[PDB]
Amino acid sequence: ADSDINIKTGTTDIGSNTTVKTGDLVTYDKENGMHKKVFYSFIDDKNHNKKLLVIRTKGTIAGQYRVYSEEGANKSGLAWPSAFKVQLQLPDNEVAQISDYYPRNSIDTKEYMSTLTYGFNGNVTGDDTGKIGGLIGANVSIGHTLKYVQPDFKTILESPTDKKVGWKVIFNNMVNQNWGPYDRDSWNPVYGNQLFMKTRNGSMKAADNFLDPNKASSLLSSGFSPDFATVITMDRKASKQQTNIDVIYERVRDDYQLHWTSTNWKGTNTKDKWTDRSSERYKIDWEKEEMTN
Amino acid sequence: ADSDINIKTGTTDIGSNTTVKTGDLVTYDKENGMHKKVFYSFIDDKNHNKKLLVIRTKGTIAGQYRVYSEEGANKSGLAWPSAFKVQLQLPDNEVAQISDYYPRNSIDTKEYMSTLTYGFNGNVTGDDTGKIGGLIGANVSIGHTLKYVQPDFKTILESPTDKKVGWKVIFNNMVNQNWGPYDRDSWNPVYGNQLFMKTRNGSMKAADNFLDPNKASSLLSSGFSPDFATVITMDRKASKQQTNIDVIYERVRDDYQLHWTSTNWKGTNTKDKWTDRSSERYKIDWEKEEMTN
Amino acid sequence: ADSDINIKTGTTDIGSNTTVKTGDLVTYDKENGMHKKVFYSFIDDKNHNKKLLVIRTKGTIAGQYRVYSEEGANKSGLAWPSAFKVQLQLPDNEVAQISDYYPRNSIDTKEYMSTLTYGFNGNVTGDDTGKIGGLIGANVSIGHTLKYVQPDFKTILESPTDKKVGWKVIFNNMVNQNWGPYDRDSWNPVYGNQLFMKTRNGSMKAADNFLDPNKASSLLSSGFSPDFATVITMDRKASKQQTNIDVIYERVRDDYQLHWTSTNWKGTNTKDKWTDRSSERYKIDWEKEEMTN
Amino acid sequence: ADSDINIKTGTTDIGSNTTVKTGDLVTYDKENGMHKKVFYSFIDDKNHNKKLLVIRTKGTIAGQYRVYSEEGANKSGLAWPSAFKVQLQLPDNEVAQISDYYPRNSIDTKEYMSTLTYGFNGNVTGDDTGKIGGLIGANVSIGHTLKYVQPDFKTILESPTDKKVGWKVIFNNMVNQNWGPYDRDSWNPVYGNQLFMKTRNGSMKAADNFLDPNKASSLLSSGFSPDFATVITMDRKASKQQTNIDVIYERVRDDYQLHWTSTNWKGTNTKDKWTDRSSERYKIDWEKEEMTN
Amino acid sequence: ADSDINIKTGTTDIGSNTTVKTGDLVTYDKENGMHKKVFYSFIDDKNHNKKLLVIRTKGTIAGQYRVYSEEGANKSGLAWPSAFKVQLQLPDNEVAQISDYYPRNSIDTKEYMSTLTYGFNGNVTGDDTGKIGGLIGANVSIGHTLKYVQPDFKTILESPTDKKVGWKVIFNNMVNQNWGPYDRDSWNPVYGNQLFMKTRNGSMKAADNFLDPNKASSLLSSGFSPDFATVITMDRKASKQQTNIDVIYERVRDDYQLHWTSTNWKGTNTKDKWTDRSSERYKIDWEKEEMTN
Ligand SMILES: CCCCCCCC/C=C\CCCCCCCC(=O)O[C@@H](COC(=O)CCCCCCCCCCCCCCC)COP(=O)([O-])OCC[N+](C)(C)C
Ligand SMILES: CCCCCCCC/C=C\CCCCCCCC(=O)O[C@@H](COC(=O)CCCCCCCCCCCCCCC)COP(=O)([O-])OCC[N+](C)(C)C
Ligand SMILES: CCCCCCCC/C=C\CCCCCCCC(=O)O[C@@H](COC(=O)CCCCCCCCCCCCCCC)COP(=O)([O-])OCC[N+](C)(C)C
Ligand SMILES: CCCCCCCC/C=C\CCCCCCCC(=O)O[C@@H](COC(=O)CCCCCCCCCCCCCCC)COP(=O)([O-])OCC[N+](C)(C)C
Ligand SMILES: CCCCCCCC/C=C\CCCCCCCC(=O)O[C@@H](COC(=O)CCCCCCCCCCCCCCC)COP(=O)([O-])OCC[N+](C)(C)C
DSSP, X not given: OGGGGTBOTTTTOSOTTOOOEEOOEEEEETTTTEEEEEEEEEEOOTTSSSEEEEEEOOOOBOOOOBOOOEETTTEEEEEEEEEEEEEEEXXXXXXXXXXXXXXXXXXXXXXXXXXXXXXXXXXXXXXTTOOEEXXXXXXXXXXXXXXXXXXXXXXXXXXXOSSEXXXXXXXXXXXXXXXXXXXTTOOOTTTBOOTTOSOSSOOSOTTTOSOOTTXXXXXXXXXXXXXXXXXXXXXXXXXXXXXXXXXXXXXXXXEEEEEEOSSSEEEEEESSOOEEOOEEEEEEETTTTEEEO | OGGGGTBOTTTTOBOTTOOOEEOOEEEEETTTTEEEEEEEEEEOOTTSSSEEEEEEOOOOBOOOOBOOOEETTTEEEEEEEEEEEEEEEOOTTOOOEEEEESSOOOOOEEEEXXXXXXXXXXXXXXXXXXXXXXXXXXXXXXXXEEEEEXXXXXXXXXXXXXXXXXXXXXXOOBOOTTSOOBOTTOOOTTTBOOTTOSOSSOOSOTTTOSOOTTTSOHHHHHOBOOOOEEEEEEOTTOSOOEEXXXXXXXXXXXXXXXXXXXXXXXXXXXXXXXXXXXXXXXXXXXXTTEEEO | OXXXXXXXXXXXXXXXXXXXXXXXXXXEETTTTEEEEEEEEEEOOTTSSSEEEEEEOOOOBOOOOBOOOEETTTEEEEEXXXXXXXXXXXXXXXXXXXXXXXXXXXXOEEEEEEEEEEEEEEEEEEETTOOEEEEEEEEEEEEEEEEEEEESEEEEEOOOOSSEXXXXXXXXXXXXXXXXXXXXXXXXXXXXXXXXXXOSSOOSOTTTOSOOTTTSOHHHHHOBOOOOEEEEEEOTTOSOOEEEEEEEOOEEEEEEEEEEOSSSEEEEEESSOOEEOOEEEEEEETTTTEEEO | OGGGGTBOTTTTOBOTTOOOEEOOXXXXXXXXXXXXXXXXXXXXXXXXXXXXXXXEOOOOBOOOOBOOOEETTTEEEXXXXXXXXXXXXXXXXXXXXXXXESSOOOOOEEEEEEEEEEEEEEEEEEETTOOEEEEEEEEEEEEXXXXXXEESEEEEEOOOOSSEEEEEEEEOOBOOTXXXXXXXXXXXXXXXXXXXXXXXXXXXXXXXXXXXXXXXXXXXXXXXXXXXXXXEEEOTTOSOOEEEEEEEOOEEEEEEEEEEXXXXXXXXXXXXXXXXXXXXXXXXXXXXXXXXX | OGGGGTOOTTTTOBOTTOOOEEOOEEEEETTTTEEEEEEEEEEOOTTSSSEEEEEEOOOOBOOOOBOOOEETTTEEEEEEEEEEEEEEEOOTTXXXXXXXXXXXXXXXXOOOEEEEEEEEEEEEEEOTTOOEEEEXXXXXXXXXXXXXXXXXXXXXXXXXXXXXXXXXXXXXXXXOTTSOOBOTTOOOTTTBOOTTOSOSSOOSOTTTOSOOTTXXXXXXXXXXXXXXEEEEEEOTTOSOOEEEEEEEOOEEEEEEEEEEOSSSEEEEEESSOOEEOOEEEEEEETTTTEEEO
């Protein structure tokens, strides 16, 4: 906090008394259904040291959650997005550099609780025949309790090198039919991986026996809208004022297959089955303060 | 709070009615993968007593979480970052001084709860043969409950001397596979240190039997992005207006080795195995209000 | 709240339409490792009655947590900071006076909860031979639950007299290895004071058997950064416009010794073993609105 | 809330477009250790109807927590502050009046919870000899739970008459050694009042066997800093423009004595033992807008 | 929320670009100890339709909690305030009207929770003689939990007619000596109403055996400070510009009597015993924008 140093709040910020020429570019890849978008802003403050440029790759990525193949009632498949990714890269011989990026890895906290209990007991037993009995007892108990919050999808920031920076979204785990949370590597010897399982021993058709997309998480079927911000700085005395950028919106799917062995349904997961990449190259003109492509 | 003294809020702050010449420097160490960055700001308020300069060493440090060595299925190793560090130092004969630093040690709180319970009981027992029995009893219980929040990574501020100040990030403990939180010194006589253990008695290959990086904390594999702020003040009447600074982004790793003894997997940890340091020297020109290197 | 009286917020504050000449002084005591700092601000509002001056003794104090003496494996010592202190004093014959101070003693609250429970029970017992039995019973229970938050270090404000004001930080208690919170006066007949105890009956060397500094609280090893604010007012018609101030950053340590009696480790604490004081005298010139020393 | 009536926020406030001549007075009573302070502010808005004056009696009161008398090991005494008080009074024949006061009595809330439980049970018992037995039972339970927050010190506002207004701080109850909260009237037939008791049956000296001041609440030993605000209004056409005020900072202590009867320590409390009052008379000049004394 | 309609926040408010002539009136009724106060404000916005006037009857009402009569040790009485009231009324033939009032009745919410539990059990019993026994059982449980917050004093708004509007404060219930909350109609066949009962079977004098005022709620003994706001609007073309207002601060007490029957103390409550009213008539001059009386 800039105010915790006695520095007046906002003194160290940049962007005062300057005109920023923003813009927008929208392009849709019908083949992959990735409504990618970039929102940039040229900031050139005379009090600064280098020209600035912030790229907000808002865009949007489809879910692609459907049964790709069905083979009778014996077995059927299913493809779902395991992880979403978006990254920005620059030419190796280029002069511009990546400075900052808002969504970054953050430390996680977990609660903890220890319980210690003492106890005592004593009773008198008697009956019609006049027998009298006694009982004295005691007990101790110790208990450790740990709780934490684990989101279904956990955003991560891949190691940002100078020339390229890339984010990532993965599938931590999901809760199905109010049962214990499952994940890709969850296994059960009898049923197997029950992540996307409708009924344990249903008699319906193989393809029909799948978890409803509405019940599952919104990202899987309805897509995930990203919001990542990066800032690019380039020296104001550079001989060449043209820069090239590349934007990637790759998405990784998985294969989920149900198998009827003799009585119950069995499920198996094949992580990293298909990968779809949609890369477009943009051009930057620092002199004209415009990104067009 | 400046407002709790009846002083109008922000009156004691510095930076009003002045022009601040900010800047930026970005350099990447491919050898160590440390995308270090410094964001400075020259504040020279005539109402102040000394020139000011705030260095925000945002930067970023890679994770370097991989199996460095594998030796068949008998055993395999693993290297992970135990602690991240970043510090700023000045020449001993220099005249500038360190004034403040935002992230600082903070007191920690823990809950507490004491429980006391009384009880009474009485029942009548009878059967077909007409036997009637009685029972009177009582019990007491006392319970102490203590809970607190312990983050996986706990930031610390090393003893800040005048010439140098240094922060630190360490590995408090981690939760594995929803089991009890482990740490570097955790030991189990049968299995041993089970921090990064995939399966207790899995039959897979030695190298494969490791916790997935996605399951583990984000910092270990995807790196840690620091945000530390320091302010440097130098007298306005100093004969020499040039100052030299040094920035360090050292990172410490550890060695984790799994051993198959006869049936189960055994794990051992060797703290402070390797250390990587990447120091760069910057130059400060108070007269020109610019940091270049 | 000034707004709860219908007075417009901030009307009663002081510091409007005036120029404040702030400053800074930094000095480091290598002998004691106390990076003391003072940040002042001269406020002289014509609408006010007396000149004002606020001293923010931010500074910083080292931890000094190390094993001072080791004597073989039989026993070893340990010195840790029991309490931190910082206070401001004025000459007895001086004319300036202490007005206010932000961090002040605050009331503490504790939860409370009373539970009352009734119960009834009735069962029928029968067997193969046709015997039928009955049982009717009842029970009552009363329970008192009390929980509160107790920080490890509890800041206190010593009785502020006109000429001097002094704060204080003490060691309330600590939680070790997720066990019951201990404190200086905690005693156990078998083991003794187990505050800084690594293992109850470890076979390692005497000096090695100590709690890791990382596990313990951050203040003990990495130091404590204070932030206390005071305001000094002096009459504007005083004949002499020069004032002298004294700043103290005294820190108190303790001695902790482990003793191996026959099988287990025994620990004893000797409170108030050593005291370190580092006092520097500053000079105030109200006429020139500057503090220099 | 002025905004809940559709009136623009702050429209009804007073203090706009006016100059307020604030001030300060500091005086210390070494005899009683009461660093009393008054911070006033003259508000005279032409749009208003009467002149205004707000007195903020911040000040500070010492704790005075020490063993006043010790008589061997048989018994010893102890004096602690039972209640703090501060009030403002005006001459009976005066014309000024008390209008408002910020800290005022507030309603208190308490939680509540009712629990109802049904239960059923049935088991089959069998042994090697083939005997088969059954058991069917049921139970009901009702539970009332009530919890609330009770601070150690509870501020109160004495009945404010026109000429004088007075606040009050009392000792609600305290928690000792993590045991049940005690208070002045708490009594135990065996031990007695165990409020400030160190050990139930300790063998140390009578004077030494007292609760450490650090463990007890901060107010008792380190003093209590008050913050009460009052506003005084006087007609602008009054013939006499001079007004006299009186400020009181009375503090009430108590006597606590431990008695060793035969084996254990016994404690008794004598409420309202001593009272200390420190009254100073200030003078107000509405015409000159200044309070001096 | 005016901003939820897309209307810019504060557009519909009234009071912009206008001068408000506020005021104040203070009068104390020594007979009843009711430090009544009214704070008004004349708002006349040309963009408005009618003249406005807001009356904030802050004032303050004493508690009057004392033992009115004592008759030996056999029995004694006690008078406490059951309910506080404040209302504003206008002449029937008057033309002004009541528009709004801030403190208004609000809906109350209560939590709810349903619990369902299944259970199974099975054990094997064996002894030295080789007898082996078994036991299999199961159980079910259902539980409804409801909790809510009930303040001791619950403010209410009486049916506001055009000519008069009146608020009300009543005594919902109180918690005594950490026991179940009692109220006026609470009855116990053995002891009776135990609201203000010190000891169930104490041997002290009848008058002394009362709950300490400090333990009870602050309002009962130390008084209640009200804060109610009303706005009065009168047409700008009215022939007569003078209006009369009446302010009432009536307070209702109760009689509480303890009776020693043979062994224990018995308590009875007589609701609505005495009523005190203190009405003063104010005069309003819209033309001069002043309220004087
Ligand atoms: C290693 C040594 C061996 C163990 C020694 C003793 C244990 C076994 C004894 C033997 C079993 C006998 C049981 C009797 C009572 C048990 C509680 C007790 O002993 O003290 C308790 C005090 O906690 C309290 O607050 C007191 C409990 C009742 C309070 C009643 C107050 C007034 C009574 C009138 C009521 C009406 C009015 C109510 C108020 C208005 C707890 O203390 P402790 O138990 O000594 O705790 C240390 C020991 N331990 C950790 C191992 C458990
Ligand atoms: C050291 C001295 C020895 C112990 C003495 C006594 C204990 C053993 C006795 C012997 C065992 C006999 C058990 C009988 C009852 C037990 C509760 C009791 O005694 O009083 C309880 C009062 O708490 C209440 O609120 C009353 C409980 C029922 C309320 C019913 C209200 C109206 C009844 C109609 C219902 C329908 C309508 C319901 C309402 C609309 C608790 O008080 P205590 O228990 O005296 O607590 C101090 C003692 N102790 C700390 C050691 C526990
Ligand atoms: C000092 C006097 C002696 C004690 C007198 C009685 C106790 C011992 C009796 C004897 C033991 C016999 C036990 C029978 C029931 C116990 C509960 C009971 O009595 O009333 C309870 C009412 O609470 C309820 O809400 C009712 C409980 C069941 C509700 C069923 C609703 C419809 C039934 C169809 C279900 C299907 C559909 C469900 C709905 C859709 C509680 O009231 P109480 O218990 O009278 O409380 C005062 C007494 N006490 C404080 C001392 C405990
Ligand atoms: C005054 C009248 C006398 C009392 C009448 C009955 C009580 C004693 C009877 C006699 C004792 C016999 C016990 C049998 C069951 C007890 C529960 C029951 O009766 O109904 C419960 C329904 O609550 C539920 O939700 C149903 C419980 C099981 C659900 C199973 C679903 C599918 C089964 C397949 C499982 C696998 C798959 C699971 C799902 C995927 C509760 O209703 P109630 O108990 O009627 O409540 C009113 C009565 N009472 C208030 C007095 C309690
Ligand atoms: C109306 C019909 C009659 C009732 C039919 C059955 C009840 C009585 C049966 C008869 C009693 C026999 C008891 C056996 C088990 C009871 C639980 C059970 O049946 O299934 C449970 C599944 O919940 C789970 O998640 C499974 C429980 C254990 C998981 C173990 C995982 C791997 C095993 C290795 C462990 C090591 C590694 C662990 C993992 C790494 C609950 O399902 P349900 O009970 O069928 O619920 C519906 C029925 N009911 C509502 C009426 C209750």
